[PDB]
């Protein structure tokens, strides 16, 4: 996909800064459109970063900070938009790069030295910030107001030009001092200043060079289907003001008729349907959260839709960050009451250290692990899952055994979905877990933690991008000094924890939550049938023939026969006589046959058949 998701970790140091580089390389590989923010933080000179060349446009903003490289590979970047801004004030900030006068004799320690944003033409919103970067040249000679949008000139710009080295100029092959950088490939192009009059975008001094009005990033030819990247949208190479209509009206009655020509909205794109972890909308958008009075229903194909509840929509449990908890970081002893029996939590789940040793000042209880038994109906999580603390009593994450899927719409640090660190436990125990909708999985700094490399991560993603992050944990050669691994019966050795209850896919059978070798068909006392590798008893009457069995389905009438008596089709060990009518007849005093037929009574009452040639029917 040419479209991918940016991150949100403004000036925070990374979680695992040794590995933090290769988080990006899996992330921004071959992607052109960013749904988020290009954040380039703490990058040393050894970073081969040439995978960044396929990036055309960021919808959000671009931040580059605290790095140690000489040049950056951001040159096919056409335009930035700035849905979000940095500090509500900036859209392009390059800060604090190089080395801020530490005790380190290096010739080129880093610092971005030229612009080399070669394809950058326009900017819609925001400001430009350049501060505290000694290793920069060529930045002052740049006319920003052309790069600013003409009809959008919130023109705050702070460019600190304190340098620490000598800057010989660019190539004199530029028409003036307008240059990206020192090469003749690196001249600053123009789309507003040489333009004039009613023309806003022109590719030269002629009025014929003036571009189409819907074209943001300039034009090749003067038609709207000729341009480079367009202003409001991009529908199939046509730069319309709107996505086409999703309904056709009477114009008199305005009667609803479904237009099939229309499209949905998604960022800068009009697309037919929404991508994988998104939501189709009645208005025709692809968003993250359904609007009000609107239920994310289980759609027919799984490509979900928000739709109107006729009744009130149910109280669906809000997790972290949504509509009741939009600031609360951790989980307290107070909010945890709300998760009683919840199965599809809307919102995230975070396990901070302070989740478990609660503040008496902000007077919360240190949490009890017995209280964690409330998470056991949980099917699906839209939010993410932050885990940093865990009780030493528990060697596992067995609270989350029942959890199938984590969509991970809101992402941790704008990027992450499963976060595991700082525990020391040995396995997880995530026996239902099968699909991560987006985000990455990070596992680091845990003492005894084996079994992660055994997890078949191929079945758990819906892009060719999202990999696993193992580092800094229990060594694999020490995991066989244990002598334990996935069990015999795990399909291709794929297990969560140790033992028979832990395989991802079993090979033989299912006895509850326990893959077993065989089931009691012909061998043991609680005999159980087979339902496509599922072993269940009968109502306890497959009276085990030496070679066979006596009621197949748990409805007790199928394998062969009875055991003691027959109430046909069913069987008893004693012919019962109940009192609870629901129609006035009881099971009247059924006499057994020789061959087990509990057979009822000839006379109504007073005369015979109380099974012992006696009395017992009243009145």
């Amino acid at each position, epitope marked *: 996909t040419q479209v991918c998701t940016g991150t949100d970790m403004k000036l925070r140091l990374p979680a695992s800064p040794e590995t933090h580089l290769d988080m990006l390389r899996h992330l921004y590989q071959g992607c052109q459109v960013v749904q988020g923010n290009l954040e380039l933080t703490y990058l040393p000179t050894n970073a081969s970063l040439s995978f960044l060349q396929d990036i055309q446009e960021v919808q959000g903003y671009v931040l580059i900070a605290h790095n140690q490289v000489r040049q950056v590979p951001l040159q096919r970047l056409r335009i930035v938009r700035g849905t979000q801004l940095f500090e509500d004030n900036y859209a392009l900030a390059v800060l604090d790069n190089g080395d801020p006068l530490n005790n380190t004799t290096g010739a080129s320690p880093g610092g971005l030295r030229e612009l080399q944003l070669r394809s950058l033409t326009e900017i819609l919103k925001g400001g430009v910030l350049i501060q505290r970067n000694p290793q920069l040249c060529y930045q002052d000679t740049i006319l920003w107001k052309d790069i600013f949008h003409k009809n959008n000139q919130l023109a705050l710009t702070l460019i600190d030009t304190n340098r620490s080295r000598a800057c010989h100029p660019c190539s004199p092959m530029c028409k003036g001092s307008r240059c990206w950088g020192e090469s003749s490939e690196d001249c600053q192009s123009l789309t507003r200043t040489v333009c004039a009059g009613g023309c806003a975008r022109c590719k030269g001094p002629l009025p014929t060079d003036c571009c189409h009005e819907q074209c943001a990033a300039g034009c090749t030819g003067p038609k709207h289907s000729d341009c480079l990247a367009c202003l409001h949208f991009n529908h199939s190479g046509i730069c319309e003001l709107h*996505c086409p*209509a999703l309904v056709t*009206y009477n114009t008199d009655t305005f009667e609803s008729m479904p237009n099939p020509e229309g499209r949905y909205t998604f960022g800068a794109s009009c697309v037919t349907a929404c991508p994988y972890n998104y939501l189709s909308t009645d*208005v025709g958008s692809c*968003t993250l959260v359904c*609007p*009000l*009075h609107n239920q994310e229903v289980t759609a027919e194909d799984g490509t979900q839709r928000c739709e109107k509840c006729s009744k009130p929509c149910a109280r669906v449990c809000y997790g972290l960050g949504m509509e009741h908890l939009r600031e609360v970081r951790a989980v307290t002893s107070a909010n945890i009451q709300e998760f009683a029996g919840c199965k599809k939590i809307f919102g995230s789940l975070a396990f901070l250290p302070e989740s478990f040793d609660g503040d008496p000042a902000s007077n919360t209880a240190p949490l009890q692990p017995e209280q964690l038994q409330v998470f056991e109906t949980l099917e699906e999580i839209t939010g993410y899952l932050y885990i940093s603390a865990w009780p030493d009593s528990l060697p596992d994450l067995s609270v989350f055994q029942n959890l199938q899927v984590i969509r991970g719409r809101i992402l941790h640090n704008g990027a992450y979905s499963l976060t595991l660190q700082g525990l020391g436990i040995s396995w997880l125990g995530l026996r239902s877990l099968r699909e991560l909708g987006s985000g990455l999985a990070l596992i680091h700094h845990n003492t005894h933690l084996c079994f992660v490399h055994t997890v078949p991560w191929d079945q758990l993603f819906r892009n060719p991008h999202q990999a696993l992050l193992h580092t800094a944990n229990r060594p694999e050669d020490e995991c066989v000094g244990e002598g334990l691994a996935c069990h015999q019966l795990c399909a291709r050795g794929h297990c969560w924890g140790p033992g028979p209850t832990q395989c991802v896919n079993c090979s033989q059978f299912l006895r509850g939550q326990e893959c077993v070798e065989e089931c009691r068909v012909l061998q043991g006392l609680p005999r159980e049938y087979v339902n496509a590798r599922h072993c269940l008893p009968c109502h306890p009457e497959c009276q085990p023939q030496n070679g066979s069995v006596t009621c197949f389905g748990p409805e007790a009438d199928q394998c062969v026969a009875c055991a003691h008596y027959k109430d046909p089709p069913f069987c008893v060990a004693r012919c019962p006589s109940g009192v609870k009518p629901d129609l006035s007849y009881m099971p009247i005093w059924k006499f057994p046959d020789e061959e087990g037929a509990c057979q009822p009574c000839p006379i109504n009452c007073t005369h015979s058949c109380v099974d012992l040639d006696d009395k017992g029917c009243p009145a």
Partner: antibody
Amino acid sequence: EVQLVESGGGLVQPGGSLRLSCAASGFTFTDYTMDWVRQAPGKGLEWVADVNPNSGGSIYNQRFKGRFTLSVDRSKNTLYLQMNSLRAEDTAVYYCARNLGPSFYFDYWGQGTLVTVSS
Amino acid sequence: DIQMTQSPSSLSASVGDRVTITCKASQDVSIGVAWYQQKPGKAPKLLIYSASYRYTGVPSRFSGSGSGTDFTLTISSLQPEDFATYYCQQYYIYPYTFGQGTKVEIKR
């Protein structure tokens, strides 16, 4: 939270035209369809119009067919509302509101303004 | 248009009165119903959607009821904050028609 800002209320003569502006904030702009509703002073409410930020489709009154036009700017989350010739029948306080259900009914309401139609 | 018939147009009461004002429609629209309160010189506020369901933040004393065309709005217990003109409205029929308003004063 969900709040609106309206501007454009002034004075016109019977016959001219005028713009409006409804600024929105604090919610997803492309998941709700902002509309217009009016009220006559000392008299009842009245529905005016309806538009998505998806097509720009001015879906409005047959009684006012062809007389008012919607133009949105979802880049600035702000729609404009134009005017037309009338003779003081529409001298009414004008309310911006969002179609809370995706059919036709409303929860939030702007502060609104009236435009005086007088020579 | 469908004739939105609120009776009365004005009344007066005391604190804690179960007072029902209904807006019978001249044509059956029995599901798509709206309800509104507007203060003098203020914006309106939503009260009941579909004549049955109290909105989030609408207090407990309110009660949306009534199907067919007889549509029941009832403050069970009057408060001084509730002295406001109220509104019935359908959303079942294009074009979309408000009521006419019903003012509430105090009885003294």
